[PDB]
């Protein structure tokens, strides 16, 4: 003795049910080991991938931010915002593309800078990070009063900056601390490439179509 | 230092070739000019002609192996620029349209092939995200060499060496080569590949 | 962190095809066949291609009605032609018998039919990318990803004047995915092939300068 | 190795007959009888004859509709005449009463009727090959393989103008099979008898020579 | 309080259900022992049955491959492919007929050769097997460099060859090693018959109509 | 050496005949000519006339038995050719059409019958696959004799001897008989059958 | 390419300023 409730005959939905096997007694080919199984998309966010900071109105030349001897010591090399879901430099990264499949995200990110110039080149850069509320610094001296790092080409060929937290915002700018120094018979201009990634605490919510 | 692809060493699952087939095979040197874009070898194809490895792979019916591949670059301290080396499993190239890719593009041989459109990797996928595959960097100021070990990855236990290519090796110059006048124009890029734990069946 | 799983990311049921029997009009044929194709839409094609290999069980549901979105009781047959079996030539063809071909008999009045297809491949997994020749057209093709054809039919003596519209849905169950692959920037040209257009579209949108909202 | 079992090889349900009541046309009779015959089709006849003796339980399902493949609610009777009982003469015949004859009453609207017939033979198994005379025509016949006649009827006062088409399906359950027999090369001539045509067809196809794709 | 799911009223299918007994309380005749019960089709594949190698454009004469004194020592007596599901010699075998009911099969096969000539006859044959990739040998000497056996009529009246593995391909050829030798008052020609069978490891998948 | 049909010995499940009914019964000899095709006896029929066995089987109502049957062939060393002997349960012959088989064909008696169409075994089934039944080979160079023991196989415990035939014995020359001039033309084929564990009921 | 398929060594100027090759056996012939 049973009674039928208001939700009976509907298939409208994402419900996880059980159907009948269409071919009972069929044996699928057994499993063998295949290297490289990835069980979560959230650890694909954590690999560093090249970030198009240039993206000015070019091809593979959009991936690298040029640096040279600019004859004016304190100057702004480049800048980019830190939100991965927004249209911009982060569309080229893998963390930015799989944020477009979700509604919300939160956590910490890191950014890595590689200097590609010659072994003979020497100089310093100033890399600053402005919190979500504040507008970007107007001058080099305003940028050093907050979070920053001074980075030296000769001593250090790569540097990392962990931005502390973000939600679906923060701006990071690069300043010339010194002029670009070279010995004779050496090329005067070089490049830098940025790599975006997400940290361990980064999370995602409510999947959506891209 | 050294990249294990997907965290594993190659291993056996047939006749097992010994030292004759497991030696280093040094391919002819590529010259990287300031104007140059890209190369891809896409082996097992590259060794099917050369040496004892090529003898086994042609006359046996089924095939399994894994490879150590060492990429290294000779430049002075007045040269700059950076390379990216990646090993991409099931790397399927495409045609750009004004349509099938030609066999010389799909199976380039022992001399590799040039990228037309490195920015899309000639697959229509961004080069920015090619770092998801096993990869290494060569920055002429930091280092001259890159090394990657690739275990055998396929859906089947064995497969044919001539029809199916398991992966491909791409060497791309993201940051171009610049040098002041008087320096050597071309910077040589040489490629040495040693197969590991290779098995053949069905002579 | 469960919504970021590979098994949750493939979870839901979605429309994998739309087909029609159409014996009303200039077409009196009165049946249809539908080769099972997972990538028929470019939205689901791009999510699947995030992986080179994957292995799953499928669950199909058939939502069927008339052009009025009216569903009077009339009998339909949903057969299943597994890979390697012949398809029906016509309404009365003998392949509509053939006991090995599983079939389902359901009225338009009834709630949608539903049935579950196992993992059908001879390989341990489905290959969405295959570099090689299975033996020009042949480059990059997997003959072993074929899942079978279905082929709906209305069970009718002759020529009813009604067109029947049927929508197919698929779920992915027990999914397992292997080595990851980047997501396609370029638009697709043709169904099977990777080929892209000669005019490259950039991945990131343009701004006025490198300096710079 | 389970798909090669004798019990899996006989497994599925399949169409064992198609019959029609037809009281619309020049035939006003309004009922039909269907002697249960397992070998009615030559595809299933050849699989069964792989064994000399076999023993099973059967499961019948009746898929019924009109010429439109439309199924309006109207009442049908599916009776079962076990071996050794008389068949109905007409619509109103008393055999449609007779409590021993099991009957099922189901509307065309309802899902297909289904019922299960036991092992009916006086022998311990069914003989598909019998060498001998049960007492010319009589050679090779088994009177004890008869399973009964069914006989569908529409329950109607008089003469509805509708023809009802009904399809019968059978499953083989709990099957057990004895001494094996080779599979027939020659085409069949007539239903019951082994007889074959005077022009012999070869078993294997011809090639140009003994040497030789 | 229950709800009806999308698969309710359907009988379309091969589903294994439970019906009502049409005659409850009926007693089927009890079981007695009948010799010869076969519980799997996979051990009907393993009996050797006669293989029509001749099958040239004849009746019971299609079952046997003739041999005689051919006056040219190195010659090809016969050849046939090793795939049982394909149209050809294997249609006469029992393993070949019950492969036509399935979609896939795999395993090892064996082939047996009987020499039917007189007790006085003497000679040798060379029986070669070519793997699935390779084309058949052009000459006797090419055939001995692979898998082969030399077989002697006087010493041995029957020989067996196990072909190692096959899937839904391999060719086996028979060569004259020597001339056909007989004493006077003895018939100069004879026959050979082949018997196909499957091994213990042979398997079948996904039943299909023939 | 000796073939047990379906792996079993005949056994009791009535009056049980002793040595009088269990002796060897040697049937008249068949001659196998180079042109000859086939024979089939199809017993219990063959012994219903002869001897004490025939006396019991006719006047008793029900019947059960099993048989040892020995086929043997006399040829010199200059004769060649091969035979196949098989015991097929429920062997139901057929008519070939330009239609019921005649009683002389279905119940051939103590002298057996000739095959018209041995290739189909006159059943429409291939002779190639007749090896699925209990069988033995006679190759004139290897051996002169073949022996098969058949237990009682039927659906019923007992049945009638006159109406129903339980199996039949077929002797077929797959490879024809060849001999050089001067040799004896016919090669005799003789058949000896001893019933085992035979029971009769309902005198 | 024919020379690398036998006994060989690849030698790099920057890394290594001197290299040694032991020829295995000889009698009163081998070419390097």
Author numbering:
A (entry chain C), E (entry chain C): 3 to 59, 62 to 172, 189 to 230
B (entry chain B), F (entry chain B): 30 to 42, 53 to 137, 146 to 250
C (entry chain A), D (entry chain A): 71 to 205, 214 to 290, 304
G (entry chain C): 145 to 172, 189 to 192
Question: Which lines from the publication concern this structure?
Answer:
Here, we demonstrate the isolation of two stable CVA6 particles with excellent natural antigenicity: one empty (CVA6 procapsid) and the other infectious (CVA6 A-particle). The capsid structures of CVA6 procapsid and A-particle at near atomic (~3 Å) resolution both closely resemble those of the uncoating intermediates of other enteroviruses.
The bottom band had a λ260/λ280 absorbance ratio of 1.65 with particles sedimenting at 128S and composed of capsid proteins VP1, VP2, and VP3 but no VP4 (lane 3), and contained packaged genome as verified by negative staining. In addition, the high infectivity of the CVA6 A-particle was measured to be 3.6 × 107 TCID50/mg, which demonstrates that A-particles can infect cells efficiently. The above results indicate that the isolated CVA6 A-particle is biochemically similar to the uncoating intermediates of other picornaviruses, but functions as a mature virus that has a stable structure and is highly infectious. The CVA6 A-particle contains characteristic structural features that are typically attributed solely to picornavirus A-particles. These include large, open channels at the icosahedral 2-fold (2f-channel) and quasi 3-fold axes (q3f-channel), and a collapsed hydrophobic pocket beneath VP1 ‘canyon’. The 2f-channel in CVA6 has dimensions of 36 Å × 8 Å, which are both similar to that in the CVA16 A-particle and the EV71 A-particle, whereas the channel is closed in the EV71 virion. In contrast to other known enteroviruses, CVA6 A-particles display unique interactions between its capsid and the packaged genome. The cryoEM density map and atomic model of the A-particle together reveal that the N-termini of VP2 and VP3 interact with the genomic RNA near the icosahedral 2- and 5-fold axes, respectively. The N-termini of five VP3 subunits extend beneath the VP1 ‘cooling tower’ to form a well-defined annulus with the key residue P3 making close interactions with the genomic RNA.
